[PDB]
Scaffold this motif. Structure first.
Motif, PDB file in Angstrom:
ATOM      1  N   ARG B  30      18.770 -11.740  -1.574  1.00 12.04           N
ATOM      2  CA  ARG B  30      18.735 -10.290  -1.345  1.00 12.04           C
ATOM      3  C   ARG B  30      17.505 -10.012  -0.520  1.00 12.04           C
ATOM      4  O   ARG B  30      16.398 -10.275  -0.989  1.00 12.04           O
ATOM      5  CB  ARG B  30      18.644  -9.535  -2.669  1.00 12.04           C
ATOM      6  N   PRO B  31      17.678  -9.527   0.725  1.00 11.38           N
ATOM      7  CA  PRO B  31      16.480  -9.136   1.482  1.00 11.38           C
ATOM      8  C   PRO B  31      15.631  -8.088   0.736  1.00 11.38           C
ATOM      9  O   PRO B  31      16.164  -7.093   0.219  1.00 11.38           O
ATOM     10  CB  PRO B  31      17.046  -8.591   2.807  1.00 11.38           C
ATOM     11  N   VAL B  32      14.339  -8.366   0.658  1.00 14.77           N
ATOM     12  CA  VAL B  32      13.384  -7.630  -0.164  1.00 14.77           C
ATOM     13  C   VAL B  32      12.163  -7.306   0.687  1.00 14.77           C
ATOM     14  O   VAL B  32      11.772  -8.088   1.550  1.00 14.77           O
ATOM     15  CB  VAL B  32      12.978  -8.411  -1.446  1.00 14.77           C
ATOM     16  N   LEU B  33      11.604  -6.122   0.472  1.00 14.67           N
ATOM     17  CA  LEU B  33      10.357  -5.722   1.098  1.00 14.67           C
ATOM     18  C   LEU B  33       9.420  -5.300  -0.001  1.00 14.67           C
ATOM     19  O   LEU B  33       9.745  -4.414  -0.801  1.00 14.67           O
ATOM     20  CB  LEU B  33      10.591  -4.581   2.098  1.00 14.67           C
ATOM     21  N   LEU B  34       8.283  -5.973  -0.085  1.00  9.01           N
ATOM     22  CA  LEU B  34       7.257  -5.621  -1.038  1.00  9.01           C
ATOM     23  C   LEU B  34       6.182  -4.799  -0.322  1.00  9.01           C
ATOM     24  O   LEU B  34       5.666  -5.205   0.721  1.00  9.01           O
ATOM     25  CB  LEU B  34       6.684  -6.904  -1.644  1.00  9.01           C
ATOM     26  N   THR B  35       5.849  -3.637  -0.878  1.00  6.70           N
ATOM     27  CA  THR B  35       4.799  -2.788  -0.333  1.00  6.70           C
ATOM     28  C   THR B  35       4.002  -2.128  -1.472  1.00  6.70           C
ATOM     29  O   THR B  35       4.279  -2.380  -2.661  1.00  6.70           O
ATOM     30  CB  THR B  35       5.434  -1.770   0.650  1.00  6.70           C
ATOM     31  N   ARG B  36       3.026  -1.293  -1.128  1.00  2.00           N
ATOM     32  CA  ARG B  36       2.113  -0.717  -2.119  1.00  2.00           C
ATOM     33  C   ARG B  36       1.420   0.520  -1.645  1.00  2.00           C
ATOM     34  O   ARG B  36       1.253   0.755  -0.446  1.00  2.00           O
ATOM     35  CB  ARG B  36       1.026  -1.729  -2.571  1.00  2.00           C
ATOM     36  N   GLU B  37       0.951   1.291  -2.621  1.00  2.00           N
ATOM     37  CA  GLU B  37       0.095   2.423  -2.387  1.00  2.00           C
ATOM     38  C   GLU B  37      -1.152   2.274  -3.277  1.00  2.00           C
ATOM     39  O   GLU B  37      -1.037   1.843  -4.423  1.00  2.00           O
ATOM     40  CB  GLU B  37       0.825   3.731  -2.706  1.00  2.00           C
ATOM     41  N   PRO B  38      -2.316   2.642  -2.777  1.00  2.00           N
ATOM     42  CA  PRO B  38      -2.481   3.268  -1.463  1.00  2.00           C
ATOM     43  C   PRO B  38      -2.708   2.203  -0.367  1.00  2.00           C
ATOM     44  O   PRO B  38      -3.028   1.065  -0.684  1.00  2.00           O
ATOM     45  CB  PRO B  38      -3.730   4.129  -1.663  1.00  2.00           C
ATOM     46  N   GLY B  39      -2.545   2.588   0.897  1.00  2.00           N
ATOM     47  CA  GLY B  39      -2.809   1.701   2.027  1.00  2.00           C
ATOM     48  C   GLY B  39      -1.554   1.239   2.763  1.00  2.00           C
ATOM     49  O   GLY B  39      -1.639   0.759   3.899  1.00  2.00           O
ATOM     50  N   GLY B  40      -0.387   1.378   2.155  1.00  2.04           N
ATOM     51  CA  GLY B  40       0.874   1.049   2.842  1.00  2.04           C
ATOM     52  C   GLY B  40       1.198   1.904   4.075  1.00  2.04           C
ATOM     53  O   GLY B  40       1.881   1.441   4.989  1.00  2.04           O
ATOM     54  N   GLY B  41       0.699   3.138   4.113  1.00  2.32           N
ATOM     55  CA  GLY B  41       0.833   3.995   5.306  1.00  2.32           C
ATOM     56  C   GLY B  41      -0.409   4.014   6.180  1.00  2.32           C
ATOM     57  O   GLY B  41      -0.333   3.685   7.383  1.00  2.32           O
ATOM     58  N   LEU B  42      -1.543   4.433   5.587  1.00  2.00           N
ATOM     59  CA  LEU B  42      -2.853   4.466   6.226  1.00  2.00           C
ATOM     60  C   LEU B  42      -3.844   3.595   5.480  1.00  2.00           C
ATOM     61  O   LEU B  42      -4.497   4.061   4.519  1.00  2.00           O
ATOM     62  CB  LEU B  42      -3.423   5.899   6.234  1.00  2.00           C
ATOM     63  N   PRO B  43      -3.994   2.323   5.906  1.00  2.00           N
ATOM     64  CA  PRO B  43      -5.027   1.420   5.300  1.00  2.00           C
ATOM     65  C   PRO B  43      -6.450   2.021   5.199  1.00  2.00           C
ATOM     66  O   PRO B  43      -7.168   1.784   4.247  1.00  2.00           O
ATOM     67  CB  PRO B  43      -5.035   0.224   6.238  1.00  2.00           C
ATOM     68  N   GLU B  44      -6.822   2.813   6.183  1.00  4.45           N
ATOM     69  CA  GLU B  44      -8.106   3.486   6.207  1.00  4.45           C
ATOM     70  C   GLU B  44      -8.290   4.492   5.067  1.00  4.45           C
ATOM     71  O   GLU B  44      -9.402   4.710   4.613  1.00  4.45           O
ATOM     72  CB  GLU B  44      -8.310   4.146   7.589  1.00  4.45           C
ATOM     73  N   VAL B  45      -7.216   5.106   4.587  1.00  2.40           N
ATOM     74  CA  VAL B  45      -7.338   5.974   3.411  1.00  2.40           C
ATOM     75  C   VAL B  45      -7.740   5.154   2.184  1.00  2.40           C
ATOM     76  O   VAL B  45      -8.576   5.607   1.402  1.00  2.40           O
ATOM     77  CB  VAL B  45      -6.039   6.784   3.152  1.00  2.40           C
ATOM     78  N   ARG B  46      -7.143   3.966   2.011  1.00  4.13           N
ATOM     79  CA  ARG B  46      -7.487   3.127   0.862  1.00  4.13           C
ATOM     80  C   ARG B  46      -8.963   2.794   0.889  1.00  4.13           C
ATOM     81  O   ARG B  46      -9.677   3.021  -0.090  1.00  4.13           O
ATOM     82  CB  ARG B  46      -6.637   1.831   0.788  1.00  4.13           C
ATOM     83  N   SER B  47      -9.418   2.250   2.024  1.00  5.90           N
ATOM     84  CA  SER B  47     -10.786   1.813   2.157  1.00  5.90           C
ATOM     85  C   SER B  47     -11.765   2.984   2.025  1.00  5.90           C
ATOM     86  O   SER B  47     -12.823   2.859   1.424  1.00  5.90           O
ATOM     87  CB  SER B  47     -10.990   1.016   3.469  1.00  5.90           C
TER      88      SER B  47
END
Ligand SMILES: Nc1ncnc2c1ncn2[C@@H]1O[C@H](COP(=O)(O)OP(=O)(O)O)[C@@H](O)[C@H]1O
Ligand SMILES: Nc1ncnc2c1ncn2[C@@H]1O[C@H](COP(=O)(O)OP(=O)(O)O)[C@@H](O)[C@H]1O
Ligand SMILES: Cc1cn([C@H]2C[C@H](O)[C@@H](COP(=O)(O)O)O2)c(=O)[nH]c1=O
Ligand SMILES: Cc1cn([C@H]2C[C@H](O)[C@@H](COP(=O)(O)O)O2)c(=O)[nH]c1=O
Ligand SMILES: [Ca+2]
Ligand SMILES: [Ca+2]
Ligand SMILES: [Ca+2]
Ligand SMILES: [Ca+2]
Ligand SMILES: [Ca+2]
Ligand SMILES: [Ca+2]
Ligand SMILES: [Ca+2]
Ligand SMILES: [Ca+2]
Ligand SMILES: [Ca+2]
Ligand SMILES: [Ca+2]
Ligand SMILES: [Ca+2]
Ligand SMILES: [Ca+2]
Ligand SMILES: [Ca+2]
Ligand SMILES: [Ca+2]
Ligand SMILES: [Ca+2]
Ligand SMILES: [Cl-]
Ligand SMILES: [Cl-]
Ligand SMILES: [Cl-]
Lengths: 186, 185
Positions: B30-47
């Protein structure tokens, strides 16, 4: 206490010019003044985030609002509480014109996000420096025409708050007009 | 596509189970995509949030800006390609941390989220529940968050699956699999 004033208008309309002239003018009258600006008066690093390539207009607005929330809580409301004249070089109307009329985001949503971000804080007067769009992330002519006309619509909807001035007038004539609108409040 | 999330306190096993879930899905082809918040959209917001302390309102609005990019650039495209997209944290994180933890009103959070997410909701959300002292302000904040997650889960029992995070890894993974199997071939 205090008096909240803002400057609005397209990029290159003279806002920073007039905002600084006003601050010095009021300081020379012995009035305490806090000169501030958006974006960056709440969260200076938001200017970095705003440059991100290919940013959705939603994320764009949410960044401006994050800065605005910090700006109101940490800069504007304390300044007003101290009895200062707080002048902001841009405020909420910038988002309404740019992210609403310019990018096409729904105004009621913008307003609803804003309600907590700003705690309902509105300027007593807003000086809109009305600039032809040609004179002014996809900030081309068609966008600036939308934004320019949006500001004028915002001014028609709140004609007590907005003072619309011709941004092509000489700098000193614009300043004198701004000062004259303020004389009854100060 | 199929959208799944994991939620819970820091150290509740989210990344671990997200990893095991992706592996399970890979094993089934099953094709799968693993992602996360925060930082999945704007990495700079996480940092930025890593090292900066802000008003709750400003904090939420940054998480939302990040979320808005995350949904548009990562999640929705992943789903359109037919992937199972797993996000290690999503909107329920803001609701629990900024809402129940820091006191922001939920209806405001949800009206902001409405345009930020385009209304995209996970089909299932696995909440890995445990007391803050068991995770692998002081404790009162983290208790408000843990109770907030449980509040959210009991309001949406069709979406939330609440698991005992203190169980061994393998048992939890198999519990997650059980819940998911009906949504796959
Ligand atoms: N009334 C005016 N007429 C002509 N040029 C002006 C006037 N006011 C400001 N300028 C000039 O126009 C440019 C943009 O002004 P600025 O104050 O930076 O606008 P904004 O802050 O709205 O982008 C500057 O070079 C400034 O010297
Ligand atoms: N079910 C479990 N039992 C014991 N240890 C675990 C379990 N799940 C995860 N861990 C370990 O606990 C720590 C926290 O797990 P992690 O997946 O990083 O949680 P989160 O992503 O929720 O912060 C890691 O060191 C991990 O190896
Ligand atoms: C404050 C604000 C600025 N802007 C834009 C105008 C400018 O193009 C840019 C930077 O503003 P500045 O040049 O006045 O500092 O941000 C918005 O689009 N929305 C907003 O809410
Ligand atoms: C996604 C999200 C995370 N958080 C918090 C929970 C974690 O403490 C932290 C995430 O840290 P991490 O980037 O090291 O996983 O951010 C929120 O408060 N609100 C949110 O919406
Ligand atoms: Ca203008
Ligand atoms: Ca300027
Ligand atoms: Ca002036
Ligand atoms: Ca930078
Ligand atoms: Ca701003
Ligand atoms: Ca706003
Ligand atoms: Ca304004
Ligand atoms: Ca942009
Ligand atoms: Ca003069
Ligand atoms: Ca993790
Ligand atoms: Ca986020
Ligand atoms: Ca959100
Ligand atoms: Ca712990
Ligand atoms: Ca709580
Ligand atoms: Ca509870
Ligand atoms: Cl008015
Ligand atoms: Cl005029
Ligand atoms: Cl369980």
């Amino acid at each position: 206490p205090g008096l909240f004033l803002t400057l609005e208008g397209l990029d290159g309309s003279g806002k920073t010019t007039q905002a600084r002239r006003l601050a010095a003018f009021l300081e020379a009258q012995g009035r305490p003044v806090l000169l501030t600006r958006e974006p960056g008066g709440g969260l200076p690093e938001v200017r970095s985030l705003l440059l991100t390539q290919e940013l959705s207009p939603e994320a764009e607005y949410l960044l401006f609002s994050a800065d605005r929330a910090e700006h109101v809580r940490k800069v504007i409301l304390p300044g007003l509480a101290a009895g200062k004249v707080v002048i902001s070089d841009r405020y909420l109307d910038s988002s309404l014109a740019y992210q609403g009329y310019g990018r096409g985001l729904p105004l009621p949503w913008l307003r609803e996000v804003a309600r907590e971000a700003t705690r309902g804080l509105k300027p007593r007067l807003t000086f809109l420096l009305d600039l032809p769009p040609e004179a002014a992330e996809g900030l081309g002519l068609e966008f600036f025409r939308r934004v320019r006309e949006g500001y004028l619509a915002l001014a028609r909807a709140e004609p007590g708050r907005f003072v619309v001035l011709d941004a092509t007038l000489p700098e000193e004539e614009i300043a004198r007009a701004i000062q004259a609108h303020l004389r009854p409040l100060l």
